[PDB]
Each structure stands twice: as C-alpha cells, then as structure tokens.
C-alpha cells in the first residue's frame, strides 16, 4: 500500500544555531509529497526484508509499543558484518555481531562494538554516510489513526555511531503476541527556515515544482508578483554516434615490440606509423612492461 | 599499540584501527629517530600537536623499500594502483621504518602478500581481499592454472640479504578528517579558566580566533554546539568544561 509523505522528514543537517535565518542546504532528505510504502501489523502478513538505500525514512504510528527493533546487514546471515538495534522494556541495545538471523526474525512478547542505554509518531531517519551511521528521531503525538498527519516537525539528531559497512538491506523487529511507513531519501536541496529559537518551522524543496524553485532562487518563502528566471533548459543528447573513418589495416607495432635487432641509443630507429588503425589498449595490456609513464595523454584513453 | 604492534598486516589487506575521543600526543611520538620517512601533506608535522580533529585513521601494512615513496597523494605504481590508493586531497601523513629487525628471519619470509595486477584500478581507501582469480581477456577460466589466469597475490620474498630497497618497511599512514563537528581527538594542552566581558584571544575545542565573550540569553538545543550567523560567521559557542 502507498500513501503521501506530505511534509515529514526534515532533520537538522548539522550542529548550528541559526536564528530567523533562511539557510539553504543540500543533503539527503525525503522528497516532499513522496510515495511511502505502508506496511501493516494486523490480522496474516509479515515484516519483509526491505531494500536499504543512501538513506531510509522510518515513520511508525504506534499505540502499544509493539515496534522495538531494526536490522542493518548486507547478507543478514552471519556471513557478513551485521548491525542490530533493539529496544526491550527499558534498555536500548546496539550490537554489530555477525548474527545468525531467523528467516522470520521476531521478538516474541567475530563480535565487535556494543552500547547499551494510534497516539504516537516515533519518526526516525536512518542515514549511513562516509563510514558513519546517524540516527534521527522525534516523538510527536497524534490522534489521526488512518494515515500520516500533515504538518511539519523537525527531527533532532538522536545518536551517531561509527560502524562503516555496506548496509544494503533492512528489516524491522515487531513484538509478537501497528503499521509503519518507509521512505527512501534522495540528494535534494532544501531551504530551511530557522525560527528565533532555532526550531525549524518550515522548509521548501528546491525541486518539487516550478513555484518551489523560485522560492529557493529568491531565497524567500513569500515571493512577490512578477516574472523570475530560475534555471536553464537543456536538451540532453540521446544517442552518441561513435563515427570514425573506415580503413582496415592494423598498425605494425608488433614488429617493433617483437623486433630482433634493437638499435643502439646513439643511432636509434625511427619507424614511422600512420594511415592505420592502432590499438594501444590491448598492446599494453601485458604485465611484462616495466615503465609506462605518459605525459601528454592519460594512458588508458589512448585507444 | 599501533606502532608497537607485533603482527603487521599484509598490504593487500591492511588494518584500519580507528582512534577517537582521546588525547593524542603526536609530538613526542615522532620525537624519535627510528622513523625513516615522515612526509606530511595536509598539515605541517610540527603543528600536529596543536590541532583538534574530528577523527583519525591508523592504516598499517608492510611493503618493500621502493614502494614507500609510492604511498603518497597523487602517486601511481603497482601497490599505488592496486593496494592502497590515496585521494589527491589527502589530509594526513605517512610513517616509515624498516623491520629487518623483525622480519625476513633467515630463510625466505612468505607471510606478506602483494596483490599484483587486478582487472581495474583501485579506488581510494579500499581494502580488497578478493583473490579468487584473474581472467586476462582470453576466456578459459575456473580451470584455475597456468595460462592467462594468473593468481593476483604474489608474495614478498623477504631476505636478511636483500639489498636496501627490497627490505621490509613497516609503514602506517594517518589520515585526519577535519570537519566542523565536535572534535573528539586533540593535542595535550591544559586549559585556563574563563574570562568574560573582555577582549580575549580564545580557542574553544580547537575552534581558534579572538573576541569578547559574554553570556548569551539565547537557548541552544542540547545537541547543538556552534552558534552561527546569517553571514555564516561564528558568533556563539558552548563552553566545553561547563555547559
């Protein structure tokens, strides 16, 4: 099932205290009005493995504290490095063993680093960047049970922790005797309006729609009546014709490299090659040669 | 423990022990004559003791003498193009000193590897441990032997009698990542108390710069550290010692 990520998803990109400043930042955000895959916890059903990405938005409506955990692995089968995050009754546990995960990994009602600590939105934004794993959080209360609420709540950075993996797959851990949403971030540019205190109260996607591009250009939320030039149109080349001349005769490098009588340094040969289809790439794709340092042209591109 | 390590890893699979949230003391560390090469690129080595970094990186491995000059920004070569690749904007620096003291015992050391030719050039900071086989254009493979399916991992023949350029140089490269983030690691400089409402030269968490420091009525959020201006100049900081 699909639904609308109306405005949720903006998190303080860094450690700053701008006051009443419209600050433009380019980073991984959940694009506005995006489709988020909406998973159920009712009746049979299950919590399938979900593809990770450059970033993942995890918003869950919770009424009975069912959801407790997340999985972040490449194989999820003890072959490869695997992070876990779980929250049992009062303790938050994070472990990164090469765990042997169940095919149905559920919490019923070479090891390395560890640390220990519908009415509710426990919005989370799990992003992995430059060998660092960041988690963002928020706990807005709501009364709309059907779907996501329109509104704007910024996400404070909960915790940062250094694993450094290819995390490419994702799954959550539900207490088994509570729907949760998933969205994938993108490298968009956002204009964030810091309030007096610094609570982000509104933001605009620079690429959502033609109106929104102007707001970024004017660097204002309200734009006055008129015409504004924003971006430049370009027609992308579709094909790329590789047209070269039509002559078929391989250049005689072979005899130079397979020569028998190399000439002395003072009287060196000056074999001239032209009007032929040289093939430098396969020529030097051999490990005999000791020095290949090229000055005027990068060696790979010669072909 | 990094420099006093007992088992240096092979170059094809180098260790990457990480160091953070501690008081590094570089100046005394290189104030020894043992190290043979100390070329520092992003930072003048003397000032290392003074800076504050977000995080550092200890990568160590073993290579022969001729390759130590290769480990460097903007360099090409066998190990350079196949084992350890430094980005051009490398901020940090390398360490070198021989280990004929500790390696090539007397009969041919064979515990250190090479990772010779591989299909494509190695991207910066990638330990590659995949040595299944090489292909060399001509197809016949998985019959792993002998012709144009050449095993990528050579071994160093390390000898006590091996010249001066073939000897084992144990190296370790430090790469500093310097960002506008709470600096975990810093030099060993004690601190004075705080003087307020006065034109004082100030250094906070290694931020640096002067100004007149006064109490602020503005309410930071708990995580935030560095106040900033509309013109993107530092105007407020949080006192590290007392919040």
């Amino acid at each position, epitope marked *: 099932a699909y639904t609308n990520s109306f405005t949720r998803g903006v998190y303080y990109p860094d450690k700053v205290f701008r006051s009443s400043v419209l600050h433009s930042t380019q980073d991984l955000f959940l694009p506005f009005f995006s489709n988020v895959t909406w998973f159920h916890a009712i009746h049979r059903f299950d919590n399938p493995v979900l593809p990770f990405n450059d970033g993942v938005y995890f918003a869950s409506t919770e009424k009975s504290n069912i959801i407790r955990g997340w999985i972040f692995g490449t194989t999820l089968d003890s072959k490869t490095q695997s992070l876990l995050i779980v929250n049992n009754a009062t303790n938050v546990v994070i472990k990164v063993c090469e765990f042997q995960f169940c095919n149905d990994p559920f919490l019923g009602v070479n090891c390395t680093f560890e640390y220990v600590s519908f009415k509710n939105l426990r919005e989370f934004v799990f992003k992995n960047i430059d060998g660092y794993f960041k988690i963002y959080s928020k706990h807005t209360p709501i009364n709309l049970v059907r779907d996501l609420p329109q509104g704007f709540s910024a996400l404070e950075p909960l915790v940062d922790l250094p694993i450094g993996i290819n995390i490419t797959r994702f799954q959550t851990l539900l207490a088994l005797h509570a729907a949760y949403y998933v969205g994938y971030l993108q490298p968009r540019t956002f204009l964030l309006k810091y309030n007096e205190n610094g609570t982000i109260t509104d933001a605009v996607d620079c690429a959502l729609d033609p109106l929104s591009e102007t707001k970024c250009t004017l660097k204002s939320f309200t734009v006055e009546k008129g015409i504004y030039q924003t971006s430049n149109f370009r027609v992308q080349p579709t094909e790329s014709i590789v047209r070269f001349p039509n002559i078929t005769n391989l250049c005689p490098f072979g005899e130079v490299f397979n020569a028998t009588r190399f000439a002395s340094v003072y009287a060196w040969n000056r074999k001239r090659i032209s009007n032929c289809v040289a093939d430098y790439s396969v020529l030097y794709n051999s490990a005999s040669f000791s020095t290949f340092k090229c000055y005027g042209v990068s060696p790979t591109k010669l072909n | 423990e990094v420099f006093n390590a007992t088992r240096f890893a092979s170059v094809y699979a180098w260790n990457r022990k990480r160091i953070s949230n501690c008081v590094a003391d570089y100046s005394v560390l290189y104030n020894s004559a043992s190290f043979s090469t100390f070329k520092c690129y992003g930072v003048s080595p003397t000032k290392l003791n003074d800076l504050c970094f977000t995080n550092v990186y200890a990568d160590s491995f073993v290579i022969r003498g001729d390759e130590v000059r290769q480990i460097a920004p903007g360099q090409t070569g066998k190990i350079a193009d196949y084992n350890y690749k430094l980005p051009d904007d490398f901020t940090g620096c390398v360490i070198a000193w021989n280990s004929n003291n500790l390696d090539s015992k007397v*009969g041919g050391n*064979y515990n250190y590897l090479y990772r010779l030719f591989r299909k494509s050039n190695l991207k910066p900071f990638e330990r590659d441990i995949s040595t299944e086989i090489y292909q060399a254009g001509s197809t016949p493979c998985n*019959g792993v032997e002998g012709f144009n399916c050449y095993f990528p991992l050579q071994s160093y023949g390390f000898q006590p009698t091996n010249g001066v350029g073939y000897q084992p140089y144990r190296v370790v490269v430090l790469s500093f990542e310097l960002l506008h983030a709470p600096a975990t690691v810093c030099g060993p400089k004690k601190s004075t108390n705080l003087v307020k409402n006065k034109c004082v030269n100030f250094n906070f968490n290694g931020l640096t710069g002067t100004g007149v420091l006064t109490e602020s009525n503005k309410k930071f959020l708990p995580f935030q550290q560095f106040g900033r201006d509309i013109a993107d100049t530092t105007d407020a900081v949080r006192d590290p010692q007392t919040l």
Partner: antibody
Amino acid sequence: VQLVESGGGVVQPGRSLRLSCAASGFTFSIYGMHWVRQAPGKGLEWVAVISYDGSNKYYADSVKGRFTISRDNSKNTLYLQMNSLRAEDTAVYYCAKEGRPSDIVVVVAFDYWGQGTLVTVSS
Amino acid sequence: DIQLTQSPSSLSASVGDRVTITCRASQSISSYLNWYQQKPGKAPKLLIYAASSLQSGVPSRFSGSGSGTDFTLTISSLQPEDFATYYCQQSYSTPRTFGQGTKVEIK
C-alpha cells in the same frame, strides 16, 4: 619453509594407499599443490593438480578415476588416495609447491619440492 | 597436447666442458620452459625459469636461452658437482609435461 612427504612403502597390488604432503613455512592456502611421480630408473611424470582451495582438481590420463587427491586448507595438508595399485604404479612420488618466481616475468614454475617417497606395489 | 624432446638423452663430459642440452616443444610456447636438476636419491632443484632466466643461488656458469619451440640450457664450465639428470619443464598449459630426462656424467 618445509614440505613433508610421507605415506609410501611396500603395498600389495590392487590395494589402496593415502599419501601425505605436509605444508609449513608459507601461506599454503594460496598455492596449487601437485603430485609428480618418478619411477625408479626413469624420469619425472606429472600426476595431479589441485586448486588453492581444492575446488578444482585435475589428473593425468594415466591415473584418472583411480587417484583422488585431497586438500585440507583448515590444517594445510595435502593427500593423494591411489586405488587399485599395480606394478606400473611403483614409483617415488614428489609433491611440489606451485607459485611464481619472486616477482613478474610471466611463468608459474615448480619451486620448493618435497623429499620423495617410494610406493612399491609388490606382492 | 605439448610434448617435450631433449637431445641428447644422455652424455658424459669432463670438468670444464661447455655442455649444451636442447629441449624442443611440440608447439610455440616461447615463455614457459623450466630447467630442473635432480641429483639421484634427492629432490630436483629449479635452475631456470622462462627458459632464459637464472634462479638465485645457482652458479653463473649455468645459463639458459631460447624461445618459441627451441630451448637450450648451457653450462660454460662443468664442475665436479654438476653431474646429474636435467629435466626441461614447460609451464604453458595444463597438463604440464616434462622431457625424458638427461643425465650428464663423468668420463
């Protein structure tokens, strides 16, 4: 670097025998292992080839089906099971290390060998 | 397949003699021959690889050359400990074969 060959001796015809090639001094898990026999009075004869992991094993036509060479990189030891021994199988056997000379030219060559064990198939 | 041919199959010579042994390959391998010396009752010793390159610790009187199908191992001056059986070993492809073995003795 030491390579230990053992397991030869007097064996009746038509029987079986397992030979041992013990590896020490180098990362044995990274090199193919070969058995080569030299029968008394005549020269060297290539017998078997295995992969560094044992996943790929090949033999000469003179021994196919009869011989089964095995590899255990966990303990880094080489073995050869010869079944249905006969008088033509009476030979000294060498297990020889694979690999290339110290660095580049091209060729993969027979470096450090074993010491030799005779397997005399006699009644 | 690849066949290795040596000539002569055996010979004898005195100390100081220049000995030449030829190994001819079935087809053009040109880069893969390996000369090994075996003293009787002991393990063979690698001498030459790539049919023209010398292995360390081997006296310089040993020398190799050749390419394509014709290969040669030479010793400028035979020595009292040289006298043994020499096998040329191509490494071009599986299954690698040997020659028939050439025993050089005293006269």
